[PDB]
Amino acid sequence: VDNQFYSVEVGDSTFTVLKRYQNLKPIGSGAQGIVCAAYDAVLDRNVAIKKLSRPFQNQTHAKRAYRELVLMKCVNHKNIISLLNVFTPQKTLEEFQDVYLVMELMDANLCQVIQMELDHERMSYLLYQMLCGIKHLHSAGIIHRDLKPSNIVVKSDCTLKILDFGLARSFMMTPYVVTRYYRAPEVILGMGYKENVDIWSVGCIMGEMVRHKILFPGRDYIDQWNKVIEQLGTPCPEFMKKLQPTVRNYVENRPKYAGLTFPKLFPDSLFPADSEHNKLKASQARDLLSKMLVIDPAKRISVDDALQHPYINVWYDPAEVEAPPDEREHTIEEWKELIYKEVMN
């Protein structure tokens, strides 16, 4: 069984992969583990391989691994990364350590794209695909709540896929920091959420594509909340009453702001605005931003309305926007077997 597999060093990590997977090259990593590009000799094409090291290590890694494994196996949409293969090189439950996820190989994450000037055609198309993916997750009862540029990937042909399935419905001993900058006020302030929680994150990413700077940076949620109100202004009263009384006291009592206008937030400097085409697309991009970056989710644009926005709808395909389509608590030994049984079936 192990002669189905070979071992290569990739940084500090050892990848033990099926012999079909040749010429591994690191392309990224995070808390879950290391990601490599490989040639798949059987499919005759490049793939991405993510190694999860002992995902049953702790509740958080285990919940995420199990959830991600179940969801990318059963979810099928051009804007959600497809799982091509799943394996472990260990032969039994007792020996089981590592899960390798094999995906279609994309070229880059959105962090690299944010560093570029994109025309309106590419920006609107990327945003359209993000919205089609979110739509599809929402239609399957998945509200991500954790979209960020590092887990959205793109090809050279401007095709986009979401890598991950977001938060569950979490103490960890790592160096690894959670990126919070794209999290909605509903998540920052823990105040219940609907589908358009994910619109906030799209607005943060779009904002960043235009500014080339994180909109709402902060050491913690305190700083991040300051950065939100400093720019969009203190929200309205009906917003507050939706908050836990402890959070409510906190928000109700911060130094007030009227905030900045969308023209000052995203000046004409930041958009292609030479041609009449680009002038009109700049005003439409700023409009859509003004509707996504809305603190109060009652007043924030929905996924469906965002897809109908003039900046986006030039791409709109019913095939892509319409297609039909866990949370428990175990010990590390139970998670190991649940994950093992999913990897084997």
Ligand X SMILES: Nc1ncnc2c1ncn2[C@@H]1O[C@H](COP(=O)(O)OP(=O)(O)NP(=O)(O)O)[C@@H](O)[C@H]1O
Residues within the interface to ligand X (CB under 6 A): 27-32, 35, 48, 50, 81, 103, 105-106, 109, 150-151, 153, 163-164
Least distance from C-beta 179 to Mg ion, angstroms?
Answer: 8
- Confirm or deny that 22 is annotated as ligand binding: no
105 binds, among ligand X, Mg ion, none (CB under 5 to 8 A by kind): ligand X
Helix (H) / strand (E) containing 14: strand 13-18
* Between 68 and 320, CB nearer to ligand X: 68
Is the CB of residue 227 less than 8 Å from the CB of residue 207? no
Identify whether 274 is a catalytic site residue: no
* Between 32 and 224, CB nearer to ligand X: 32
- Confirm or deny that 50 is annotated as ligand binding: yes
List, as own/partner pairs, every contact residues 21-24 make where C-beta atoms lie below 8 angstroms and the sequence separation is at least 24, other chains included: 21/47, 21/49, 21/102, 24/49
* Between 164 and 208, CB nearer to ligand X: 164
31 binds, among ligand X, Mg ion, none (CB under 5 to 8 A by kind): ligand X
In the region spanning residues 110 to 139, those forming contacts with Mg ion, defined by CB under 5 A, are: none
- Confirm or deny that 29 is annotated as ligand binding: yes
Helix (H) / strand (E) containing 250: helix 245-252
Least distance from C-beta 39 to ligand X, angstroms?
Answer: 14
- Cα–Cα distances (Å) from 187 to 43, 182, 291, 335, in that order, read 41, 10, 18, 26
Question: By rule CB under 5 A, what count of residues binds Mg ion?
Answer: 2
DSSP structural state of residue 275 = S
- Confirm or deny that 247 is annotated as ligand binding: no
Q: Which of 304, 127, 129 is nearest to 207 (CA)?
A: 127
Query: Both tokens of residue 311?
Result: 């900046």
Least distance from C-beta 152 to Mg ion, angstroms?
Answer: 9
Is the CB of residue 120 less than 8 Å from the CB of residue 69? no
* Between 152 and 285, CB nearer to ligand X: 152
Number of C-beta neighbours around residue 75 at 10 A: 19
- Confirm or deny that 162 is annotated as ligand binding: no
**Binder of Mg ion out of 13, 60, 97, 150 (CB under 5 A):** 150
* Between 182 and 225, CB nearer to Mg ion: 182
Q: How far apart are CA 273 and CA 294, in angstroms?
A: 25
Helix (H) / strand (E) containing 285: helix 276-292
Q: How far apart are CA 293 and CA 180, in angstroms?
A: 16
Least distance from C-beta 201 to ligand X, angstroms?
Answer: 13
> Is residue 109 a contact point for Mg ion (CB under 5 A)?
no
Q: Which residue among 2, 44, 119, 146 is the active-site one? A: 146
How far the first Cα of the chain sits from its last, in Å, is 17
In the region spanning residues 286 to 315, those forming contacts with Mg ion, defined by CB under 5 A, are: none
Residue 335 phi, psi (nearest 5): -70, -40
Q: State the residue number with the nearest CB to ligand X.
A: 30
How many helices (H) and strands (E) in the chain?
Answer: 13, 10
* Between 27 and 197, CB nearer to ligand X: 27
Q: How far apart are CA 136 and CA 75, in angstroms?
A: 9
Least distance from C-beta 323 to ligand X, angstroms?
Answer: 21
> Is residue 231 a contact point for Mg ion (CB under 5 A)?
no
300 binds, among Mg ion, ligand X, none (CB under 5 to 8 A by kind): none
Number of C-beta neighbours around residue 2 at 10 A: 10
Per the annotation, where are the binding residues?
A: 27-35, 50
Active site residues: 146
Per the annotation, where are the binding residues for ATP?
A: 27-35, 50
List residues binding Mg ion (CB under 5 A).
150-151
